[PDB]
Every structure is written in structure tokens, then in C-alpha cells.
Coordinates of N, CA and C and ligand atoms in Angstrom, one line a residue:
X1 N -11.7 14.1 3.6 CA -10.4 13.2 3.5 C -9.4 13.7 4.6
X2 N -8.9 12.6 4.8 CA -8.3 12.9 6.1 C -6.7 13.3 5.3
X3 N -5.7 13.8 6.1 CA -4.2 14.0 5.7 C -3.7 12.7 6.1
X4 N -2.6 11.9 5.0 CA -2.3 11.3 5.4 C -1.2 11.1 6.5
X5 N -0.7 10.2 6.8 CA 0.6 10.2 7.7 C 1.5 11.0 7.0
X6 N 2.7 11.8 7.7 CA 4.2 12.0 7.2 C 5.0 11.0 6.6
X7 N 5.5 10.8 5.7 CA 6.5 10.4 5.5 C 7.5 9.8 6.4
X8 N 7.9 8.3 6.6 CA 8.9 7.7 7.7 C 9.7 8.2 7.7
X9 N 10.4 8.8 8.8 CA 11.6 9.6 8.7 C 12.9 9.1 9.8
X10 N 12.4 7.6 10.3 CA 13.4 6.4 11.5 C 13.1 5.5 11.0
X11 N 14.1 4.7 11.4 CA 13.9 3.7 10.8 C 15.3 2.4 11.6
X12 N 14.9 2.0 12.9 CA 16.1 1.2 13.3 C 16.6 0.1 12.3
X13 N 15.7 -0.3 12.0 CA 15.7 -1.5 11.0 C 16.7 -1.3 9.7
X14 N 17.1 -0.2 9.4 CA 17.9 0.5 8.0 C 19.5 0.7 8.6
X15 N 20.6 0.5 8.2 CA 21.6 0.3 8.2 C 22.2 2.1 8.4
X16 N 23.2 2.7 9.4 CA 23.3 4.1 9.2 C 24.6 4.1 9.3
X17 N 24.7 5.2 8.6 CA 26.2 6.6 8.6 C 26.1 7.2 8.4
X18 N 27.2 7.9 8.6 CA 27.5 9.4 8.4 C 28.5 9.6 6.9
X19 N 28.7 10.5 6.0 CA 29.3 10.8 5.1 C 29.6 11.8 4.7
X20 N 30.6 12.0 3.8 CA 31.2 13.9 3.4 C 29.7 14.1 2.6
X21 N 29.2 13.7 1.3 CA 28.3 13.9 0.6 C 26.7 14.0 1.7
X22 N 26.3 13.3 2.5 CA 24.9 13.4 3.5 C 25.2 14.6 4.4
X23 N 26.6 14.8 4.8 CA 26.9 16.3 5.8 C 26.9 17.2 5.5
X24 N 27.2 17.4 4.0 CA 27.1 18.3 2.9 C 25.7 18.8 2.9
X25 N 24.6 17.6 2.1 CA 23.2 17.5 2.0 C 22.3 18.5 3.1
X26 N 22.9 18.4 4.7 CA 22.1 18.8 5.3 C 23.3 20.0 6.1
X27 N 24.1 20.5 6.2 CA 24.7 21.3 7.1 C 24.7 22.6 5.4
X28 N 25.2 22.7 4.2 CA 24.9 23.2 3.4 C 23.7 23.4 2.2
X29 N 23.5 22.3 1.6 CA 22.1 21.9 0.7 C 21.0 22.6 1.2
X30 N 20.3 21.3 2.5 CA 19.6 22.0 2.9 C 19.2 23.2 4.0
X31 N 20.0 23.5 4.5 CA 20.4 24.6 5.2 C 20.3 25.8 4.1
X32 N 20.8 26.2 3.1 CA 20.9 27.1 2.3 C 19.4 27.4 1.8
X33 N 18.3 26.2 1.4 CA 17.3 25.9 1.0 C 16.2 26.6 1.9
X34 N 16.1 26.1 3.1 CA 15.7 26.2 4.1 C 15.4 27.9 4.4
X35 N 16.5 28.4 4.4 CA 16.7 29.8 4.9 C 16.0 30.8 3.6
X36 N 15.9 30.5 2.6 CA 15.4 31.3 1.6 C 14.0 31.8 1.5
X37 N 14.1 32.3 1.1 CA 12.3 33.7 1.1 C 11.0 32.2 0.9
X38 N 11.4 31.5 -0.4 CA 10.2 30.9 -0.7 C 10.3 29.5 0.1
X39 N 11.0 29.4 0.8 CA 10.9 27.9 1.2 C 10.1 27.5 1.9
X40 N 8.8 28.6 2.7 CA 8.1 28.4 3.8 C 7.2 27.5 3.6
X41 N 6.6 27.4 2.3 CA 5.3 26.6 1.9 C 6.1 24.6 1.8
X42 N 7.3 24.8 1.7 CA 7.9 23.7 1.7 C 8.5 22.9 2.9
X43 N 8.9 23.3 3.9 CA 9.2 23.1 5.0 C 8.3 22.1 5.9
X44 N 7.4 21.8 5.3 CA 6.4 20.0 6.2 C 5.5 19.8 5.3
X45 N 5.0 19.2 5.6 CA 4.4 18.1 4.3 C 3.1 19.3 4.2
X46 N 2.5 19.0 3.0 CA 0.9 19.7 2.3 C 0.2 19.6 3.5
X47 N -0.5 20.2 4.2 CA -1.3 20.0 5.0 C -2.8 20.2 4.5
X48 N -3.6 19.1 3.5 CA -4.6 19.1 2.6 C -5.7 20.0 3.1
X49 N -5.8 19.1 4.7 CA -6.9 20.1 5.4 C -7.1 21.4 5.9
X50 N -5.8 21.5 6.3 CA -5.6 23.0 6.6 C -6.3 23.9 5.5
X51 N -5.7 23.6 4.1 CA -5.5 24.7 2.8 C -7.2 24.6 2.4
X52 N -7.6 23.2 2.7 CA -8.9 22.9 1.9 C -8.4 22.3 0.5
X53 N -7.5 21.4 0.3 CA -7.0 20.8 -0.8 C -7.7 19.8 -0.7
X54 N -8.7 19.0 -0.8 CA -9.0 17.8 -0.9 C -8.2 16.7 -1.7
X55 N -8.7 17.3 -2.8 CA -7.8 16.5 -4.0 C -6.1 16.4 -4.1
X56 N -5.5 17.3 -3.1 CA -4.2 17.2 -3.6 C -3.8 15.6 -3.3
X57 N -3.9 14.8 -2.5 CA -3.5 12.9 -1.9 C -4.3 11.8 -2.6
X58 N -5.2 12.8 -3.6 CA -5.9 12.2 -4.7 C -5.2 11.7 -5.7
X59 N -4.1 12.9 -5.6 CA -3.3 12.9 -7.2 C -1.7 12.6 -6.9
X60 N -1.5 13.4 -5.7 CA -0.1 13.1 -5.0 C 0.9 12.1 -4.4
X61 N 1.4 10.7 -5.1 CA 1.0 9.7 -3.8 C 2.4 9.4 -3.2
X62 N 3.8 10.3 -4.0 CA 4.6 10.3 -3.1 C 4.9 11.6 -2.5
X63 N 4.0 11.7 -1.5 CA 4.6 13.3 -1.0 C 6.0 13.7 -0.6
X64 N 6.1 15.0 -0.4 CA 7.6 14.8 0.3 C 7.9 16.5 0.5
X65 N 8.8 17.1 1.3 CA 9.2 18.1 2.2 C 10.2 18.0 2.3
X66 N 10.7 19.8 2.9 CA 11.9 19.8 3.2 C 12.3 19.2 4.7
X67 N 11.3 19.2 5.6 CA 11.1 18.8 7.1 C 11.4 17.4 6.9
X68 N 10.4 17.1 6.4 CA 10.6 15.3 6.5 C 12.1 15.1 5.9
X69 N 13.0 15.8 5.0 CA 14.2 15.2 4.2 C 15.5 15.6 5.2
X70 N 14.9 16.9 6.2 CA 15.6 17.2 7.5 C 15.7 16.4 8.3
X71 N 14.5 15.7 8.8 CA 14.5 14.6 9.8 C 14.8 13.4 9.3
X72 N 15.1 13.2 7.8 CA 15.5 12.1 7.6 C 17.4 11.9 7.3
X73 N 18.0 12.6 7.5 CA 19.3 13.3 7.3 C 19.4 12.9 8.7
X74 N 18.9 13.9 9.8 CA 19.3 13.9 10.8 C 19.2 12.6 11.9
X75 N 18.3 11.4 11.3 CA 17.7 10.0 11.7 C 18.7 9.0 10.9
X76 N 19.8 9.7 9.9 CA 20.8 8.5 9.2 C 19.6 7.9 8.5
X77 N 18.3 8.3 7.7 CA 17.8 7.5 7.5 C 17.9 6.9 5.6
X78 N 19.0 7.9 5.5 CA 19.1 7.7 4.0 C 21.4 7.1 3.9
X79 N 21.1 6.0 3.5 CA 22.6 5.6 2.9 C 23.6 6.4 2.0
X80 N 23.0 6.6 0.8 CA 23.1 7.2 -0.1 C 22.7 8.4 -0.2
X81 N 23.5 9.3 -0.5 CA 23.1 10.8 -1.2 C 22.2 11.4 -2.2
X82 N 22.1 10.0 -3.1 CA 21.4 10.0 -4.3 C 20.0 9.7 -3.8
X83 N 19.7 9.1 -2.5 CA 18.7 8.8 -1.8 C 17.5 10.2 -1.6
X84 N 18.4 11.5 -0.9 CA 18.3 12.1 -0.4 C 17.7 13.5 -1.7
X85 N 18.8 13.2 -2.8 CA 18.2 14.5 -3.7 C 17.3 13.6 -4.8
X86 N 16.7 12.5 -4.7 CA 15.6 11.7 -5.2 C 14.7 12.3 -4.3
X87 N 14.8 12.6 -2.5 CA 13.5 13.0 -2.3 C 13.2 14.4 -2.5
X88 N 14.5 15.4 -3.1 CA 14.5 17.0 -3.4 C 13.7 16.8 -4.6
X89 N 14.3 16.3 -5.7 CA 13.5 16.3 -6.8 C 11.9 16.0 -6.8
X90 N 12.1 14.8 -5.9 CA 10.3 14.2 -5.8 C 9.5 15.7 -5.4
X91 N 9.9 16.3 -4.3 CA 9.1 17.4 -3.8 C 9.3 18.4 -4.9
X92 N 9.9 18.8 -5.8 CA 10.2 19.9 -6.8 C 8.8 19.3 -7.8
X93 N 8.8 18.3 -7.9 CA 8.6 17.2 -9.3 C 7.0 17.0 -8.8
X94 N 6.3 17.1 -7.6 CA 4.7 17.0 -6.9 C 4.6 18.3 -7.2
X95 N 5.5 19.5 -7.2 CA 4.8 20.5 -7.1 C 4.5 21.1 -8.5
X96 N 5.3 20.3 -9.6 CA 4.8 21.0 -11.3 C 4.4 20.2 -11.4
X97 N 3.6 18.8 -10.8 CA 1.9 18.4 -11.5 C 0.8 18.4 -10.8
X98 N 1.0 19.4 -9.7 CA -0.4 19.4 -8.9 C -0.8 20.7 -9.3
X99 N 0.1 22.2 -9.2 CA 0.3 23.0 -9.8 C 0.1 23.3 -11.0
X100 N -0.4 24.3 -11.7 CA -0.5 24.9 -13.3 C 0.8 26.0 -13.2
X101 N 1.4 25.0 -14.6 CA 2.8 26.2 -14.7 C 2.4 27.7 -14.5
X102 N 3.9 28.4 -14.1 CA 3.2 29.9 -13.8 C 2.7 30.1 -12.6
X103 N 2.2 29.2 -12.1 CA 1.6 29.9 -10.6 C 2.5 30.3 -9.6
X104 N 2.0 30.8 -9.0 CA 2.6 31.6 -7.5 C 4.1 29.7 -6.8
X105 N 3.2 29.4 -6.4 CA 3.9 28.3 -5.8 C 5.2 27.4 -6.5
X106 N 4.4 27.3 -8.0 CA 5.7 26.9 -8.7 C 6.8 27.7 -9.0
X107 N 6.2 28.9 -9.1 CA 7.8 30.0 -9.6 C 8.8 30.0 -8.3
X108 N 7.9 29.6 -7.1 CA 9.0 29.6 -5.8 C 9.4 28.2 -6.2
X109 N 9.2 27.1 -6.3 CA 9.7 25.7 -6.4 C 10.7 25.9 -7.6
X110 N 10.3 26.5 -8.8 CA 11.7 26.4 -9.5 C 12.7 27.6 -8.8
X111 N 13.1 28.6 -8.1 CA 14.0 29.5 -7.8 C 14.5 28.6 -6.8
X112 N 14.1 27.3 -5.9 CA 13.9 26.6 -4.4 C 15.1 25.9 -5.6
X113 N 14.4 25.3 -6.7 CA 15.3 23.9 -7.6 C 16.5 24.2 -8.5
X114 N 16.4 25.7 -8.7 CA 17.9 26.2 -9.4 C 18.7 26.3 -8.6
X115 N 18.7 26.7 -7.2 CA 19.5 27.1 -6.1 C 20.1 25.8 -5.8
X116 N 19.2 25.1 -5.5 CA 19.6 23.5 -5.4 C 20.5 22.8 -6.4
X117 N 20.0 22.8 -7.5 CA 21.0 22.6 -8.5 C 22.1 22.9 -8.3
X118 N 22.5 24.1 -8.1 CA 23.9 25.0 -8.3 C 24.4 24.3 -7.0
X119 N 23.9 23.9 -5.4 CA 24.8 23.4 -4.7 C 25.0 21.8 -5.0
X120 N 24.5 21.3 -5.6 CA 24.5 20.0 -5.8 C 25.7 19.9 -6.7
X121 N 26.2 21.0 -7.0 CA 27.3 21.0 -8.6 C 28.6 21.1 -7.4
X122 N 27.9 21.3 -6.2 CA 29.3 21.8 -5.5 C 29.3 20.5 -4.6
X123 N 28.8 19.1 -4.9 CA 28.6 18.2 -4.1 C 30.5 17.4 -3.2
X124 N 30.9 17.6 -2.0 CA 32.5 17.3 -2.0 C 32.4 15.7 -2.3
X125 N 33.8 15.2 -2.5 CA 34.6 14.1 -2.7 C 33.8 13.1 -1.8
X126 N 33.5 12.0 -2.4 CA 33.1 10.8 -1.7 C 34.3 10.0 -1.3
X127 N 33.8 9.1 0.3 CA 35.1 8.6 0.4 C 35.1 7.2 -0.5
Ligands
7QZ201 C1 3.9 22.5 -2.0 N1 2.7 23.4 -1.9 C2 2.6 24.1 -0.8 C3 1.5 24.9 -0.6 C4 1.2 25.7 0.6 C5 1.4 25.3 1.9 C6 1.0 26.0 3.0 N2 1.1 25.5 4.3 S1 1.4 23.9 4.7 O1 1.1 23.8 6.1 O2 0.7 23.1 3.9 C7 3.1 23.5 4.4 C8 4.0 24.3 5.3 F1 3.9 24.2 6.6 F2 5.3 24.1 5.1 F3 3.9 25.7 5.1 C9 0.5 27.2 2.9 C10 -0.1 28.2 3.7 C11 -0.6 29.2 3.0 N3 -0.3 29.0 1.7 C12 -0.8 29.8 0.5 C13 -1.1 31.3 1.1 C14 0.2 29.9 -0.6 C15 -0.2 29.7 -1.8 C16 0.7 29.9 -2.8 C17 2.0 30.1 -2.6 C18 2.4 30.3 -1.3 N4 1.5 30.2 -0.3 C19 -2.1 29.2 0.0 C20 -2.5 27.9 0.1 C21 -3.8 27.4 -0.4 C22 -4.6 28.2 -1.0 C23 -4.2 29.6 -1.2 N5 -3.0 30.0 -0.7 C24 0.3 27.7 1.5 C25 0.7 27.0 0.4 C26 0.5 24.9 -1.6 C27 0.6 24.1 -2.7 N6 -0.4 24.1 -3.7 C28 -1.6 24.8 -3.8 O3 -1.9 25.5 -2.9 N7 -2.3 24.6 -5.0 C29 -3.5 25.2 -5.3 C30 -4.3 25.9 -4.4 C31 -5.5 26.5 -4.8 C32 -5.9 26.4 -6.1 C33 -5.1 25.7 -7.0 C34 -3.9 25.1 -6.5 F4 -3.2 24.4 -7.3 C35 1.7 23.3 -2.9 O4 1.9 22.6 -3.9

């Protein structure tokens, strides 16, 4: 099986700005995310073939990464905020059902999804 494409991360065709809550997302959120011990396995999409995952695009059909949610931040390619931590969760949320609770990978995805939490509590003022 082949890997599929990345995740669209441009998009001229989609309406853009900038906002306190999206500048937040990526100058803090993910920035803070990013820089942490376990985030390395997260940082671009599953690479099936690399790992020898065959089955992971079997079972996984919305992937998603911290790279792709980088480049899509930095492409205006999300309106909304709520846009942006739908794709945090999605990637938290592929990794406890491809995963067996307890494993190596998920204990890093939940310490990746508490941290996140806690800055999402610190999300600033919308205009
Ligand atoms: C979200 N996500 C990400 C990865 C993942 C991604 C990688 N690189 S990448 O290029 O894809 C993404 C990038 F660039 F950002 F790093 C690598 C490169 C090496 N590794 C390890 C050593 C590994 C394992 C556990 C924890 C940490 N590192 C590895 C991988 C495969 C087999 C053994 N060890 C990776 C793991 C794996 C998942 N899941 C997984 O590996 N599941 C699994 C494996 C074997 C048996 C049972 C399993 F469920 C999963 O979900």
C-alpha cells in the first residue's frame, strides 16, 4: 500500500485571516506542543511505509499531524479556531484507536493532549 497524500494544507479557493485566537493556536499552542520531548512521532503525518504499518490507512481515514496543522495556520487555511483544535483532537483521537491503551505512543499523545488542554483554557479574547 502506498501512503496516502498529506492532508491539504492551501487552499486559494477558502476565504483568510488572521485572528487573536489562530495567533494564539500557532505562535503559543502549537509552538509549546511542538517543542516537547514526545512530540517527535507527531510532527508529519504516519509515514505507513516507512514504519511497515500497512494497516494503519486501513483503519485511519482522517489522518492528521502537528506539521500539516502548522502549515495550515501558517496558509490562513483554517477560519475558525474551533477548526484548528478539531484537527488537535482528530490527531490525539487516531492515535487511541489505532493504538492499544498503555502503549508507548499513547502515553506520549495523552501528556501531548493534557498540555494542550491546559493552553486551550488560556485561549485570549475573540474580536
Ligand atoms: C502517531 N503515531 C506515530 C508513530 C511513529 C512515527 C514515526 N515516524 S513518522 O515519520 O511516521 C512521523 C514523524 F515524522 F513525525 F516522526 C516513528 C519513527 C520511529 N517510531 C517508533 C520508534 C516509535 C514507536 C513508539 C513511540 C515512539 N516512536 C516506532 C514505529 C513503528 C514501530 C516501532 N517503533 C515512530 C512512531 C507510530 C504510531 N503507531 C504505531 O507505531 N503503532 C504500532 C506499531 C507497531 C505495533 C503496533 C502498533 F500499534 C502512531 O500512532
Amino acid at each position: 500500500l502506498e501512503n496516502p497524500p498529506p492532508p491539504e494544507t492551501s487552499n486559494p479557493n477558502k476565504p483568510k485571516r488572521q485572528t487573536n485566537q489562530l495567533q494564539y493556536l500557532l505562535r503559543v499552542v502549537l509552538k509549546t506542543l511542538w517543542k516537547h520531548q514526545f512530540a517527535w512521532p507527531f510532527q508529519q503525518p504516519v509515514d505507513a511505509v516507512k514504519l511497515n504499518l500497512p494497516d494503519y490507512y486501513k483503519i485511519i481515514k482522517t489522518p492528521m499531524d502537528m506539521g500539516t496543522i502548522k502549515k495550515r495556520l501558517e496558509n490562513n487555511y483554517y477560519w475558525n479556531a474551533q477548526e484548528c483544535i478539531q484537527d488537535f483532537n482528530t490527531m490525539f483521537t487516531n492515535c487511541y484507536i489505532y493504538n492499544k491503551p498503555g502503549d508507548d505512543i499513547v502515553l506520549m499523545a495523552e501528556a501531548l493532549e493534557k498540555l494542550f488542554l491546559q493552553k486551550i483554557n488560556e485561549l485570549p479574547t475573540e474580536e
